[PDB]
Amino acid sequence: RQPRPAKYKFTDVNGETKTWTGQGRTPKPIAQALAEGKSLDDFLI
Numbered sequence: 001r002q003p004r005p006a007k008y009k010f011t012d013v014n015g016e017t018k019t020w021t022g023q024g025r026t027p028k029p030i031a032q033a034l035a036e037g038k039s040l041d042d043f044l045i
Contacts, residue, residue, distance in 0.1 A: 008044045 005021050012018065013025035020030070021040045033042060 008040050010040060010043060 001022065003022055005019070005023075007019045008021060009017070010020040010030055011027055012020070012023075013027040013031075022034075026034055030040070030043070034040070
């Protein structure tokens, strides 16, 4: 839920683009990657 969140590159569910690891809104693209059980570390920067 709320793990030590660092800086990363991703696109929010609204089309934004900031640091994200496990915020809340699971953007469609990231949703698939995260839904698989993997963290943002895969798409980190």
